[PDB]
Amino acid sequence: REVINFNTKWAFTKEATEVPKEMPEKWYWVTLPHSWNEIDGQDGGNDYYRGTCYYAKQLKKSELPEADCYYLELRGANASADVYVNGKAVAHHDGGYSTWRVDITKELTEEENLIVIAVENGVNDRVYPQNADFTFYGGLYRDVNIIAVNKSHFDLDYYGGPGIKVTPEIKGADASVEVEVFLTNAAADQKLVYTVKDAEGKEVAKTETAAGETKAVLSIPAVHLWNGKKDPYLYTAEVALVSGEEAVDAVSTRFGCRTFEIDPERGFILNGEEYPLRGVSRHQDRWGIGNALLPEHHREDIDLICELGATTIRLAHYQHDQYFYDLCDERGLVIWAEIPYISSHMPNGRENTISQMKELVVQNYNHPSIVVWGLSNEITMDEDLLENHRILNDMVHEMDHTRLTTIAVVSMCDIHDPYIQIPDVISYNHYFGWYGGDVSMNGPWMDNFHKEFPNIPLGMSEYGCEALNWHTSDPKQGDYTEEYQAYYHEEMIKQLFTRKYIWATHVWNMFDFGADARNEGGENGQNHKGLVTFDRKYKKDSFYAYKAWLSDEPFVHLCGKRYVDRVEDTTKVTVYSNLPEVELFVNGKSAGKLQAEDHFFHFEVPNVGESTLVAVAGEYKDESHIRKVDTFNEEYSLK
Amino acid sequence: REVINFNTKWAFTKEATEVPKEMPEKWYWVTLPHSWNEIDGQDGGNDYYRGTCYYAKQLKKSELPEADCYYLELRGANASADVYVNGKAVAHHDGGYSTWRVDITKELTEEENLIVIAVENGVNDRVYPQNADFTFYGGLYRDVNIIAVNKSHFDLDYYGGPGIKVTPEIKGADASVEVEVFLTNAAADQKLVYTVKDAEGKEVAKTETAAGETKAVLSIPAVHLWNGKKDPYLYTAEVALVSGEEAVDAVSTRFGCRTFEIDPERGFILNGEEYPLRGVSRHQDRWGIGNALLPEHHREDIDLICELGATTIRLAHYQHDQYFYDLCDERGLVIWAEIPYISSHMPNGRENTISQMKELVVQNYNHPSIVVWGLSNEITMEDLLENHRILNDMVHEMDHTRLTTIAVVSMCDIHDPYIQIPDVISYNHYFGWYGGDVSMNGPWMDNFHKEFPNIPLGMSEYGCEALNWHTSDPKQGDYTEEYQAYYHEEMIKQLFTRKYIWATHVWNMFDFGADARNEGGENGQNHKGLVTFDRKYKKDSFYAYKAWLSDEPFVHLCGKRYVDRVEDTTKVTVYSNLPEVELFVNGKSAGKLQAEDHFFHFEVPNVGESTLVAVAGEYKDESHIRKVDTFNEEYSLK
Amino acid sequence: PKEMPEKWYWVTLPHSWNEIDGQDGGNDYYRGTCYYAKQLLELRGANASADVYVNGKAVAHHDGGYSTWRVDITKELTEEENLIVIAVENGVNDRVYPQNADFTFYGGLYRDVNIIAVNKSHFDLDYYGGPRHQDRWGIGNALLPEHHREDIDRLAHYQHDQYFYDLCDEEIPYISSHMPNGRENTISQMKELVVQNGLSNEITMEDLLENHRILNDMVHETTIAVVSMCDIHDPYIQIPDVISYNHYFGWYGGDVSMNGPWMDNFHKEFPNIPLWNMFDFGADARNEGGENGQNHKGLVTFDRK
């Protein structure tokens, strides 16, 4: 089995009449990943181009390895797509976030075969998402491959799945691992060789069956538990399809061995031990390239999230890339995965909810980082809606006996609504202190639901506050300053991180992200609730509030480095640190030492002329600068 | 080559959760043709179910004659459809009105294969129609067939087309007919036997070539031209694919030999002679069954149109059934066919205009009745202009034998750029119904013909609503049968007298389904027909046209449903294509009229209960009236 | 040049600098940018590309050496003595037709250059200059009225001069090899040709189709001349209103006889589409026949004697 990368140099256009019959010569050249909304869907106006665009590329047999079948594999085509080979339609897919594939062997009738993929992200009542606070970036924004396999091969046709399904059971110190496999055009005389490998590639179990027996149970004695950030230990499972003495096809996947519970009072439990889930959410886009993300972009996002110290990520609002989920498995992050069943129940969207959720579970069952499947987000923003949830919830329980269902509930929805009783666990999306109200309401709002429903495990799946490069010494809801967002998250941390019954918390959001309908805060087309800016270059102060509570990397961080000119004669200077004591020095002389148990060191500092600020904790330091002015620098003010 | 009927007993549901793995047991049974909008799309409130529906049926290999390939053929799935064979997707189609086919041989692996067809007619920005005055009836509303063929066979995969393209050219008393054919998996050592046959089935031309030479030009000595209603003569081309001495596949099509012009001053011309196109439009639906029309329904519609004597039908607003177009060929009607590029240009809609026009032309090229392809209807009600330049060039590229046209909304400025694109244009004017006055129509047409003396100008729509309301004082907006008849009397006098109007089309021949309509006292219908929705009642306006267009002699008494009348002396209209009519009231002559325009306007004493007899030669009609003190408010909508 | 030149060569329009070296062989006629300077605007013939400068400032540029173009100058005439400079260029590029053809691309202001004095409100001047070969031995394309009349006593491959159509009263140079970046020039020269008064010649010696479709739609809102060996079922033949072929059977090999027969076969094939040179003319690449520099498929000599 060979995987050919197929991303290089497609002809692209937005204004093409019909499927072209010859390779276009005046189209725009893109190399996938590509989204055509990389600029117009990150800048405001809710006007990013939505419509059908064409990608065209020639497939030459002289470059393909010799093989019985060739499959076109699409990792991401947002939102709907059709595939033509030498002009004939061979495939249609609805769902911008999952892998789908098609056997194109029969249509490769020429030495040069025109491969045309039409991709559409228009408005309709059928394909989720339609109503949501993010840009539906159109395009082939994930890899396109060609898969060359033998006539008998592991299934490439079942909902974009890998063709292998690993299910570990923990029994004391050992593990029982069921490995199931799915075959296309297999012969009764072929064998299946199942192997499990160690983190160092060392074989630790091996068994064989006839091809008609597509399950096997392998034992792993003295199992290394996947145990989160403490030890994200991963095994590999391999199954080869063997004709006589030779492997004609092989599939593999990594997996981790763990149990968990979501206890309504003790919160998240992992392998029998309490394992608090304190984290963030992440969209799969980035400034300048839309959602056309490279592997290094996925690695940077998770590096920054690891540096903050999050033990969980909510991967809203749709299926992310396989490489990002692998990264979570490798790094020990606990993951919430969901489908874009969002904001507003579309009666005609029901088929597509089913479809996307099947692809979500089938394609991601093997990732040990995932513990919950999310059915919908804020879906109540009614009987048909309830039936859609029953069906999704029973299908997920049908397909996956080892994970729990959840929803993300909109702030205002009555806690006695019937759909809250449907999934195994729930979380709420609250913005008290940002969309009105006050940051102190969150804690008690959660306590009151907990009182009403003591057996429903309750998390916080969204909470957050907007912040851009604006500054103040009087932080207030709606000035959009870095300082108010810092205060907000300090207060959420204090309320949320001390309530063990909150099973998972997810800052909305880890990064600023694309939302073309947003036109607020001084910079349009973006939600700026991030802890880090859209291009990943600037960690806002609120990022270090969380690092001070969740990371064991010793550091000391000076807040307000961008708020330089201050009117006040004595100015507040906040330091965040996971060390026990910080000393602040103003132009070289101590303004005192503090010991903040909640890691929030609030100093008061004379502001005369220009001053250099140095904060010192053990052997770690940070530096900033302020200066005294008579009038407020109107460049700090959004108004 | 065997075509098997596959309409029989599908399981059907409106709840589109998932494609069922096994044949269902508590869905609803339907035999195609079928639309789920047959009731909720004909009754008002714009609320008919739009969404995804499932059809499920078992295909059993034993019941299939043996063959190398099996194609599923769908004649109509409205609007967008996906086909599954044993849970595997094998085709997708957008376009409620055209034939599409898929090879499914490779998926017939069980002895009982589960066919599932998902059909969707919801709201989107991509598939036409989305904005129009008619119900987008969801479903498998035309035949589904299994087509079993030999490994080598005429093309079944190209835009649903027949596999055989027939172009007659004429010069002098003879005809020359090019027959082109398209093959799938043919082998070099195979032959093509082409034949042309008489109306009586006698061979008139024959020739053999090798499977590689897929075009042939056969000659018809002393050809009988297809000449409209006067002689709708059809030949039949057949081509067989032969392996050795054995025909392994054959296709065929009827065709007609005819030339025509659309002269900007002389109007329509057919085989050199002026041939005026005065007629009607026709929607493909019927009260009670939606668009799930049977062949008997197509036959009755065309009978009623022939009885009226139309020489043309505008088959709005989309591709019609092949069987209806065949009737049109057989009866010598001259057809306008069009795609549902309608009301409002969708920027995301370009691709679907292209696909529907390709299918329209590929599947209907052989129909001699068809003279014009319609690009759009009221589309203005720059991306638009490009969209029309693409359609216009593509049709002109595909069909060198027919002209392009459009239907222009009423208020559209006559200098607008898009009017310059097609070969010919027509307007939809409703002066005298949607405001205005009926006298405006002819002069408006005169202005355009002055302003643009060489763009052939037709009237693609005009009409007036009518239900079972009556009055002795017809006014626009009373929805009375009497006002509609007056409107049509005046439109005939204005339109039928202007030779330069190349085609007139009454909107509409029949009342039809429009679920957003909520007026005239019966919601869910456009009541502008000459004939009611169940085809059971000919409104009086039907006869005003018949008197001008039919050669069957008749006399028709208007107002039969207006019995109770208050006035001592009442107006009684007779339509007849005979020169002279005498009308009798209780056996007493109330007057003798000759009317050149066939509209016999009598006045009559109204006393007691009276019986009316209209007499022209040996032809009579009969009606009854009654004198009443007060108006019968049952005759009144308000 | 800032000042009116002193040592340049004086010429009086019409003028081409290829009057001699473009009629004598070797395909070496001077092709490049040349300058005309005058003290003091409409140009009837500036082959092939030109820039007008008034007191030192560009005021108009034109590509197309066969059609009229004007530029309002009223505001640049700022002194009593105004230096008008016209740079004319007939070089090689992939953009301005013609580039490949059997005739000399005689450079210069080979037709009149007038000044038009107009009332402010006026019949318009600025919409594309709107209201046999054109050369002779010894003077290139710098023909005088007398040379038109003597010729009168098919106007390929370009717009001829207004006065000559008048002697007809009383096609663009889209020729030989299709130039992808030449699309705009065929458009501009077609808009010009039709406004102030043939789509292609031998252009096959899909982007090409798109170019024809663009031209045909713009003029209609038509004909081509087809190279001999072209394929009668080529898609582009079904684009214009009518077509005509060019055949040299019996000269470029073969026999005179194949011609009659040949056009018959076409007519049978396409029953619905209706199916050189008067004088010798200048073709500097021609090095055949003992007299190099002329195509001698002419009935009359180059000097019309």
Ligand SMILES: Cc1cc2nc3c(=O)[nH]c(=O)nc-3n(C[C@H](O)[C@H](O)[C@H](O)COP(=O)(O)O)c2cc1C
């Ligand atoms: C995680 C997972 C992966 C699966 N992968 C495959 C597969 O690759 N090929 C296959 O034929 N069946 C696969 N199955 C089996 C299907 O679930 C099975 O066809 C089921 O009966 C169909 O129901 P569904 O439409 O809800 O998936 C998989 C099941 C699960 C839970």
Ligand SMILES: Cc1cc2nc3c(=O)[nH]c(=O)nc-3n(C[C@H](O)[C@H](O)[C@H](O)COP(=O)(O)O)c2cc1C
């Ligand atoms: C009326 C008509 C019917 C046609 N039927 C077929 C056909 O059945 N099979 C086919 O391959 N091409 C058919 N063609 C078109 C030509 O063969 C066409 O140039 C080519 O096959 C595909 O061109 P495309 O890119 O437009 O699809 C048909 C064309 C016309 C005008």
Ligand SMILES: Cc1cc2nc3c(=O)[nH]c(=O)nc-3n(C[C@H](O)[C@H](O)[C@H](O)COP(=O)(O)O)c2cc1C
């Ligand atoms: C033969 C002809 C001559 C024209 N002459 C002029 C003109 O002299 N001045 C003018 O403003 N428009 C003139 N037009 C303007 C037309 O309106 C023009 O073709 C079109 O409407 C828009 O022009 P555009 O190319 O600038 O978009 C002329 C049009 C034609 C067909």
Ligand SMILES: [Ca+2]
């Ligand atoms: Ca935008």
Ligand SMILES: [Ca+2]
């Ligand atoms: Ca209704």
Ligand SMILES: [Ca+2]
């Ligand atoms: Ca020379």
